[PDB]
């Protein structure tokens, strides 16, 4: 299936991951459909993320891995519950906390 995962694109002893959308059958650092961000666990962890594209792929049904799911839980990408029109029409703001 289509997945959201991290490819190790760095140096020995310095792991830098690229957040991409790719088929499950593709190799880990090989082919991908779209690049949606970056990830660095060495700092105290800087995350770059395309919010619109990540929302689009999680809406069309790309299954994220565990670490990519945590990265999407951060930066508020899993707000599809709030954006599903759950008997409301306004948009809440939880990013400030």
Number of residues that bind RNA (CB under 7 A): 58
Measured in whole angstroms, the distance separating CA 57 from the mean position of its chain's CA atoms is: 9
Q: Does 10 bind RNA (CB under 7 A)?
A: yes
Q: Does 60 bind RNA (CB under 7 A)?
A: yes
Classify 90 as helix, strand or coil: coil
Strand partners, 11: 14
Dihedral of CA 18/7/17/57: which sign? positive
Please list every residue in the chain followed by a chain break, i.e. its C lies more than 2.5 Å from the next written N: 44
Q: Does 36 bind RNA (CB under 7 A)?
A: no
Q: Does 55 bind RNA (CB under 7 A)?
A: no
Q: Does 1 bind RNA (CB under 7 A)?
A: yes
Residues at the site binding RNA, with contacts judged by CB under 7 A: 1-3, 5-18, 23-31, 33, 38, 41-42, 45, 48, 59-63, 65-74, 76, 78-82, 84, 86-88, 94
């Amino acid at each position: 299936a289509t997945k959201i995962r991290l490819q190790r694109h760095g140096r020995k002893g310095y792991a830098f991951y690229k957040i991409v959308v790719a088929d499950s059958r593709a190799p880990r650092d090989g082919k991908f459909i779209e690049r949606i961000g970056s990830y660095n666990p060495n700092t105290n962890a800087t995350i770059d993320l395309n919010f619109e594209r990540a929302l689009y792929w999680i809406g069309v049904g790309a299954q994220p891995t565990d670490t990519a799911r945590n990265i999407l839980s951060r930066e508020g990408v899993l707000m599809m519950k709030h954006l599903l029109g759950g008997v409301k029409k306004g948009a809440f703001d939880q990013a400030a906390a």
